[PDB]
Design an enzyme around this catalytic site. Structure first.
Site, PDB file in Angstrom:
ATOM      1  N   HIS A  59       0.833  -1.180   0.000  1.00  0.00           N
ATOM      2  CA  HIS A  59       0.000   0.000   0.000  1.00  0.00           C
ATOM      3  C   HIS A  59       0.883   1.252   0.000  1.00  0.00           C
ATOM      4  O   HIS A  59       1.887   1.325   0.721  1.00  0.00           O
ATOM      5  CB  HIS A  59      -0.954  -0.012   1.190  1.00  0.00           C
ATOM      6  CG  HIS A  59      -1.757   1.229   1.379  1.00  0.00           C
ATOM      7  ND1 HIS A  59      -2.613   1.744   0.427  1.00  0.00           N
ATOM      8  CD2 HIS A  59      -1.846   2.047   2.440  1.00  0.00           C
ATOM      9  CE1 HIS A  59      -3.213   2.807   0.925  1.00  0.00           C
ATOM     10  NE2 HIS A  59      -2.761   3.001   2.151  1.00  0.00           N
TER      11      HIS A  59
ATOM     12  N   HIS B 103       0.645   4.760   1.096  1.00  0.00           N
ATOM     13  CA  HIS B 103      -0.215   5.282   2.079  1.00  0.00           C
ATOM     14  C   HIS B 103      -0.397   6.771   1.884  1.00  0.00           C
ATOM     15  O   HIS B 103       0.599   7.520   1.914  1.00  0.00           O
ATOM     16  CB  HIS B 103       0.300   4.971   3.479  1.00  0.00           C
ATOM     17  CG  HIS B 103      -0.527   5.594   4.554  1.00  0.00           C
ATOM     18  ND1 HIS B 103      -1.091   4.859   5.577  1.00  0.00           N
ATOM     19  CD2 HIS B 103      -0.938   6.876   4.729  1.00  0.00           C
ATOM     20  CE1 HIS B 103      -1.781   5.675   6.364  1.00  0.00           C
ATOM     21  NE2 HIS B 103      -1.691   6.909   5.884  1.00  0.00           N
TER      22      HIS B 103
ATOM     23  N   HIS C 242       3.930   0.553   2.722  1.00  0.00           N
ATOM     24  CA  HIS C 242       4.052  -0.527   3.662  1.00  0.00           C
ATOM     25  C   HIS C 242       3.315  -1.788   3.235  1.00  0.00           C
ATOM     26  O   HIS C 242       2.339  -1.683   2.536  1.00  0.00           O
ATOM     27  CB  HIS C 242       3.594  -0.066   5.057  1.00  0.00           C
ATOM     28  CG  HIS C 242       2.165   0.400   5.176  1.00  0.00           C
ATOM     29  ND1 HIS C 242       1.111  -0.469   5.332  1.00  0.00           N
ATOM     30  CD2 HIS C 242       1.632   1.637   5.345  1.00  0.00           C
ATOM     31  CE1 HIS C 242      -0.013   0.207   5.507  1.00  0.00           C
ATOM     32  NE2 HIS C 242       0.265   1.502   5.516  1.00  0.00           N
TER      33      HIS C 242
ATOM     34  N   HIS D 267       0.528  -4.478   3.304  1.00  0.00           N
ATOM     35  CA  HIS D 267      -0.880  -4.425   3.714  1.00  0.00           C
ATOM     36  C   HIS D 267      -1.408  -5.849   3.677  1.00  0.00           C
ATOM     37  O   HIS D 267      -2.582  -6.104   3.333  1.00  0.00           O
ATOM     38  CB  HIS D 267      -1.701  -3.428   2.856  1.00  0.00           C
ATOM     39  CG  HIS D 267      -2.697  -2.607   3.642  1.00  0.00           C
ATOM     40  ND1 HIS D 267      -3.690  -3.170   4.416  1.00  0.00           N
ATOM     41  CD2 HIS D 267      -2.779  -1.266   3.856  1.00  0.00           C
ATOM     42  CE1 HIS D 267      -4.363  -2.206   5.037  1.00  0.00           C
ATOM     43  NE2 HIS D 267      -3.830  -1.034   4.709  1.00  0.00           N
TER      44      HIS D 267
ATOM     45  N   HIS E 182      -6.954   4.926  19.327  1.00  0.00           N
ATOM     46  CA  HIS E 182      -6.924   4.294  18.042  1.00  0.00           C
ATOM     47  C   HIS E 182      -6.813   5.325  16.918  1.00  0.00           C
ATOM     48  O   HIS E 182      -7.693   6.136  16.743  1.00  0.00           O
ATOM     49  CB  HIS E 182      -8.160   3.439  17.867  1.00  0.00           C
ATOM     50  CG  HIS E 182      -8.304   2.406  18.942  1.00  0.00           C
ATOM     51  ND1 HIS E 182      -7.556   1.244  18.948  1.00  0.00           N
ATOM     52  CD2 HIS E 182      -9.048   2.385  20.077  1.00  0.00           C
ATOM     53  CE1 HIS E 182      -7.860   0.535  20.025  1.00  0.00           C
ATOM     54  NE2 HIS E 182      -8.770   1.198  20.719  1.00  0.00           N
TER      55      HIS E 182
ATOM     56  N   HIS F  52      -7.558   5.312   9.937  1.00  0.00           N
ATOM     57  CA  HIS F  52      -7.149   5.725   8.583  1.00  0.00           C
ATOM     58  C   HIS F  52      -8.167   5.323   7.564  1.00  0.00           C
ATOM     59  O   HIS F  52      -8.631   4.166   7.536  1.00  0.00           O
ATOM     60  CB  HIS F  52      -5.760   5.089   8.300  1.00  0.00           C
ATOM     61  CG  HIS F  52      -5.292   5.219   6.889  1.00  0.00           C
ATOM     62  ND1 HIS F  52      -5.180   6.450   6.256  1.00  0.00           N
ATOM     63  CD2 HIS F  52      -4.864   4.293   5.998  1.00  0.00           C
ATOM     64  CE1 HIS F  52      -4.750   6.261   5.014  1.00  0.00           C
ATOM     65  NE2 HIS F  52      -4.557   4.966   4.824  1.00  0.00           N
TER      66      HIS F  52
ATOM     67  N   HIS G  84      -9.787   1.776   8.786  1.00  0.00           N
ATOM     68  CA  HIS G  84      -9.302   0.880   9.815  1.00  0.00           C
ATOM     69  C   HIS G  84      -8.391   1.505  10.832  1.00  0.00           C
ATOM     70  O   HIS G  84      -7.772   2.552  10.563  1.00  0.00           O
ATOM     71  CB  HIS G  84      -8.608  -0.278   9.126  1.00  0.00           C
ATOM     72  CG  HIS G  84      -7.286   0.062   8.459  1.00  0.00           C
ATOM     73  ND1 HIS G  84      -6.083   0.087   9.144  1.00  0.00           N
ATOM     74  CD2 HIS G  84      -6.976   0.333   7.160  1.00  0.00           C
ATOM     75  CE1 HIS G  84      -5.107   0.436   8.308  1.00  0.00           C
ATOM     76  NE2 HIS G  84      -5.632   0.623   7.100  1.00  0.00           N
ATOM     77  N   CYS G  85      -8.249   0.855  11.991  1.00  0.00           N
ATOM     78  CA  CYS G  85      -7.258   1.307  12.935  1.00  0.00           C
ATOM     79  C   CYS G  85      -5.880   1.003  12.370  1.00  0.00           C
ATOM     80  O   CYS G  85      -5.612  -0.138  11.919  1.00  0.00           O
ATOM     81  CB  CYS G  85      -7.406   0.637  14.296  1.00  0.00           C
ATOM     82  SG  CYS G  85      -6.285   1.297  15.446  1.00  0.00           S
ATOM     83  N   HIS G  86      -4.981   1.954  12.505  1.00  0.00           N
ATOM     84  CA  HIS G  86      -3.632   1.815  11.941  1.00  0.00           C
ATOM     85  C   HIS G  86      -2.634   1.170  12.945  1.00  0.00           C
ATOM     86  O   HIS G  86      -1.441   1.080  12.649  1.00  0.00           O
ATOM     87  CB  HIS G  86      -3.111   3.121  11.317  1.00  0.00           C
ATOM     88  CG  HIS G  86      -2.300   2.912  10.056  1.00  0.00           C
ATOM     89  ND1 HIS G  86      -1.162   2.114  10.011  1.00  0.00           N
ATOM     90  CD2 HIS G  86      -2.520   3.320   8.771  1.00  0.00           C
ATOM     91  CE1 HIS G  86      -0.682   2.124   8.765  1.00  0.00           C
ATOM     92  NE2 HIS G  86      -1.481   2.855   8.005  1.00  0.00           N
ATOM     93  N   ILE G  87      -3.101   0.789  14.151  1.00  0.00           N
ATOM     94  CA  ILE G  87      -2.322  -0.138  14.985  1.00  0.00           C
ATOM     95  C   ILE G  87      -2.477  -1.489  14.298  1.00  0.00           C
ATOM     96  O   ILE G  87      -3.575  -2.058  14.217  1.00  0.00           O
ATOM     97  CB  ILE G  87      -2.780  -0.151  16.474  1.00  0.00           C
ATOM     98  CG1 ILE G  87      -2.458   1.200  17.172  1.00  0.00           C
ATOM     99  CG2 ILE G  87      -2.098  -1.313  17.291  1.00  0.00           C
ATOM    100  CD1 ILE G  87      -3.354   1.489  18.350  1.00  0.00           C
TER     101      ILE G  87
ATOM    102  N   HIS H  25      -4.263  -4.365  15.820  1.00  0.00           N
ATOM    103  CA  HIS H  25      -5.702  -4.199  15.902  1.00  0.00           C
ATOM    104  C   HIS H  25      -6.365  -4.431  14.582  1.00  0.00           C
ATOM    105  O   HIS H  25      -7.407  -5.101  14.520  1.00  0.00           O
ATOM    106  CB  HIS H  25      -6.116  -2.846  16.433  1.00  0.00           C
ATOM    107  CG  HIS H  25      -5.535  -2.522  17.775  1.00  0.00           C
ATOM    108  ND1 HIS H  25      -5.758  -1.311  18.383  1.00  0.00           N
ATOM    109  CD2 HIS H  25      -4.716  -3.214  18.598  1.00  0.00           C
ATOM    110  CE1 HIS H  25      -5.119  -1.281  19.536  1.00  0.00           C
ATOM    111  NE2 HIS H  25      -4.470  -2.412  19.684  1.00  0.00           N
TER     112      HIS H  25
ATOM    113  N   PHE I   2     -10.145  -4.869  13.337  1.00  0.00           N
ATOM    114  CA  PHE I   2     -10.638  -3.492  13.586  1.00  0.00           C
ATOM    115  C   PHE I   2     -10.657  -2.728  12.256  1.00  0.00           C
ATOM    116  O   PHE I   2      -9.861  -1.775  12.070  1.00  0.00           O
ATOM    117  CB  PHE I   2      -9.762  -2.811  14.615  1.00  0.00           C
ATOM    118  CG  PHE I   2     -10.460  -1.876  15.558  1.00  0.00           C
ATOM    119  CD1 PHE I   2     -11.820  -1.824  15.662  1.00  0.00           C
ATOM    120  CD2 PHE I   2      -9.696  -1.007  16.335  1.00  0.00           C
ATOM    121  CE1 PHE I   2     -12.437  -0.981  16.533  1.00  0.00           C
ATOM    122  CE2 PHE I   2     -10.302  -0.113  17.223  1.00  0.00           C
ATOM    123  CZ  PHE I   2     -11.665  -0.102  17.320  1.00  0.00           C
TER     124      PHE I   2
END
Ligand SMILES: *[C@@H]1O[C@H](CO)[C@@H](O[C@@H]2O[C@H](CO)[C@@H](O[C@@H]3O[C@H](CO[C@H]4O[C@H](CO)[C@@H](O)[C@H](O[C@H]5O[C@H](CO)[C@@H](O)[C@H](O)[C@@H]5O)[C@@H]4O)[C@@H](O)[C@H](O[C@H]4O[C@H](CO)[C@@H](O)[C@H](O)[C@@H]4O)[C@@H]3O)[C@H](O)[C@H]2NC(C)=O)[C@H](O)[C@H]1NC(C)=O
Ligand SMILES: *[C@@H]1O[C@H](CO)[C@@H](O[C@@H]2O[C@H](CO)[C@@H](O[C@@H]3O[C@H](CO)[C@@H](O)[C@H](O[C@H]4O[C@H](CO)[C@@H](O)[C@H](O)[C@@H]4O)[C@@H]3O)[C@H](O)[C@H]2NC(C)=O)[C@H](O)[C@H]1NC(C)=O
Ligand SMILES: *[C@@H]1O[C@H](CO)[C@@H](O[C@@H]2O[C@H](CO)[C@@H](O)[C@H](O)[C@H]2NC(C)=O)[C@H](O)[C@H]1NC(C)=O
Ligand SMILES: *[C@@H]1O[C@H](CO)[C@@H](O)[C@H](O)[C@H]1NC(C)=O
Ligand SMILES: [Cu+2]
Ligand SMILES: [Cu+2]
Ligand SMILES: [Cu+2]
Ligand SMILES: [Cu+2]
Length: 499
Positions: free
Chosen positions: A64, A66, A109, A111, A395, A398, A452-455, A458, A463
């Site tokens: 991805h 980003h 990064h 994905h 959280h 993104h 989605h959460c970018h952690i 998660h 998430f």
């Protein structure tokens, strides 16, 4: 820097960024991977060559880019089982897209699962030869990119499902774990009297970082690719996946100065020079700084950020003066996250491939209850109320394919329909402050886009949801290359241990 037309070879290698040796996923031999760069208007042709051999860190991959809108090239966006099947080991795939209408600081990064946490991640910059901020600095180059990364001594699939923090914060790819404060630190060389555009990119899988530089203030001029009004601060809390450009005036005494990036949890503080790198003015000796940290008296607050150029908020000046408002209710049961009662599990057939195969309604789309169909040419408001039901807060959510207006920021009870900052990763704050972070955007970009959460851990626990934007136009707007059509058959043909 490489790009805009480049090969990116993905392999497993031994690395030791903090002196501890481990197998990681690297890009052209290194992690963080190399800087990819171009100019506004460019076509990128980034040939990703999957030469991975380690199943624990996944031999398949997907990248991805980003922050990029990817208008008409939704197939190139990267998320596994949303926009493509992974690239399979021994194969290559060409991401081929244009960036006609954006400039600033991005990153790239993996994905696929939590593979970016294992090392597949790097900075990505799109320059503007007419940058409205160009009068503020003298230097902007490969060496003024500053990366932050959390680094773990145990691999993503081998440690806890939800790690309690990193072994080491890496700054430009080096840092100390608190057990070995001998490991080499990064040095960012500056020259007295020169003004630098520093492009700070969080490549974090999880922790946020409170970034400061002993003896200097920082003038923020870009937020996740959006030009800001200049904002002088003495510390920046930067969430996973966020980016800021700041100008640093190198007009203090020639010396060494600590660069600090303190994570929100894990190994905190700066004992032994953990969570640190060195700002060395030319002429200073090749030794660690002895500067001390002072209290941050002008910390960044997101509400204080505003676009450089006036940018109307989508919709009308009222709570829910939009065409469609969606509330995201969070839950968590110890292993999985849920949004509006659904924990995301990737579907067999990528969401984009389902759409190209006729699936245009939430009823027809999979995963069931995780896909939100949006009308075209509409204003959308999404709220993400903080709740104790979703531990691991705050959280940073993104939204792919869009830059949105942050009408309500974390730590603020106020709604700004006038001049709120636009960005693409936003902290959704905490239940302690009764946060109800709210964003707005317009649907002028047909395709399925992950929200989605970018952690990463998660995301992996579900998430996420998909925003399926203007599904009836997806096919016409996003013609796919044959190589893309080939991905799923090849991936689906793999032995599960070669995945
Ligand atoms: C695929 O990718 C995964 C994910 O990274 C790799 O997983 C690794 O699995 C191995 C083996 O099962 C785990 O090894 C354990 O490693 C720890 C810590 O090791 C490190 O520290 C050592 C101590 O100083 C040091 O010797 C090591 O250096 C070697 O390894 C590196 C990395 O490959 C290499 O670069 C060097 O050249 C060295 O060869 C390293 O820095 C180790 O302590 C463990 O041992 C206890 O473990 C067992 C069981 O308890 C026991 O037998 C011993 O007595 C010991 O006390 C153990 O060996 C490793 O932790 C995993 N890595 C990560 C990041 O999670 C996997 O290896 C990859 N496959 C392939 C084919 O490479
Ligand atoms: C980065 O930003 C911070 C916050 O904006 C900024 O800190 C401010 O620095 C000034 C230094 O000018 C501080 O004020 C000084 O404080 C000392 C101690 O009380 C006084 O003695 C100083 O008086 C001397 O110098 C003055 C010139 O400014 C003279 O006018 C005066 O008569 C004295 O000779 C002076 O008031 C100020 O208190 C802080 N503010 C804080 C901590 O909130 C910092 O300077 C910026 N850093 C850089 C490198 O730009
Ligand atoms: C956070 O804001 C959202 C969006 O305004 C709120 O959800 C709305 O609440 C009112 C109930 O008073 C409804 O009429 C709207 O239709 C709701 N939107 C939904 C549920 O889709 C939410 O209540 C706010 N939450 C918190 C915790 O303040
Ligand atoms: C949490 O929910 C998930 C997904 O629905 C379920 O499969 C899992 O077993 C649950 N875990 C616990 C600890 O209850
Ligand atoms: Cu991302
Ligand atoms: Cu993204
Ligand atoms: Cu999260
Ligand atoms: Cu994403």
């Amino acid at each position: 820097a490489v790009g805009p037309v480049a090969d990116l070879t993905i392999t497993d290698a031994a690395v030791s960024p903090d002196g501890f040796s481990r197998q990681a996923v690297v890009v052209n031999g290194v992690t963080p991977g190399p800087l990819v760069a171009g100019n506004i208007g460019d076509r990128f042709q980034l040939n990703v060559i999957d030469n991975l051999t380690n199943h624990t860190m996944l031999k398949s991959t997907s990248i991805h880019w980003h922050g990029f809108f990817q208008h008409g090239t939704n197939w190139a966006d990267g998320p596994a089982f949303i926009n493509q099947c992974p690239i399979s080991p021994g194969h290559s795939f060409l991401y081929d897209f244009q960036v006609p209408d954006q400039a600033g600081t991005f990153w790239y990064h993996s994905h696929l699962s939590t593979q970016y946490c294992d090392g597949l991640r790097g900075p990505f910059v799109v320059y503007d030869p007419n940058d409205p901020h160009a009068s503020r600095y003298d230097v902007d180059n490969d060496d003024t990119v500053i990366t932050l990364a959390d680094w773990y001594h145990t691999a993503a699939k081998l440690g806890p499902r939800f790690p309690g923090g990193a072994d080491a914060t890496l700054i430009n790819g080096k840092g100390r774990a608190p057990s070995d404060s001998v490991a080499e630190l990064s040095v960012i060389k500056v020259t007295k009297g020169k003004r630098y555009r520093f492009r700070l990119v969080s490549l974090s899988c999880n922790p946020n970082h409170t970034f400061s530089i002993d003896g200097h203030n920082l003038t923020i001029i870009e937020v996740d690719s959006v030009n800001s009004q200049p904002l002088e601060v003495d510390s920046i809390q930067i969430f996973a996946a966020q980016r800021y450009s700041f100008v640093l005036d190198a007009n203090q005494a020639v010396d060494n100065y600590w660069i600090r990036a303190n994570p929100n949890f894990g190994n905190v503080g700066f004992d032994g020079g953990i969570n640190s790198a060195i700002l060395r003015y030319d002429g200073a000796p090749a030794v660690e700084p002895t500067t001390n940290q002072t209290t941050s008296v002008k910390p960044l607050n997101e509400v204080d950020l505003h676009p450089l150029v006036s940018t109307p908020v989508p919709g009308s000046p009222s709570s829910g003066g939009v065409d469609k408002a969606i509330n995201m209710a969070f839950n968590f049961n110890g292993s999985n996250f849920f949004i509006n009662g659904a924990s995301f599990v990737p579907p067999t057939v990528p969401v984009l491939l389902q759409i190209l195969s006729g699936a245009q309604t939430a009823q027809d789309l999979l995963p069931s209850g995780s896909v939100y169909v949006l009308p075209s040419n509409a204003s959308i408001e999404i709220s993400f109320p903080a709740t104790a039901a979703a531990p691991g807060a705050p959280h940073p959510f993104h939204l792919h394919g869009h830059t949105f207006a942050v009408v309500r920021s974390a730590g603020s009870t106020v709604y700004n329909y006038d001049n709120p900052i636009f960005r693409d990763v936003v902290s959704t704050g905490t239940p302690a402050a009764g946060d109800n972070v709210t964003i707005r955007f317009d649907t002028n970009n047909p395709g399925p886009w992950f929200l989605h959460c970018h952690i990463d851990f998660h995301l992996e626990g579900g998430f996420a949801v998909v925003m399926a934007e203007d599904t009836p136009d997806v096919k016409a707007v996003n013609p796919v290359p044959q190589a893309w059509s080939d991905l799923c058959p090849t991936y689906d043909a793999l032995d599960p241990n070669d995945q």
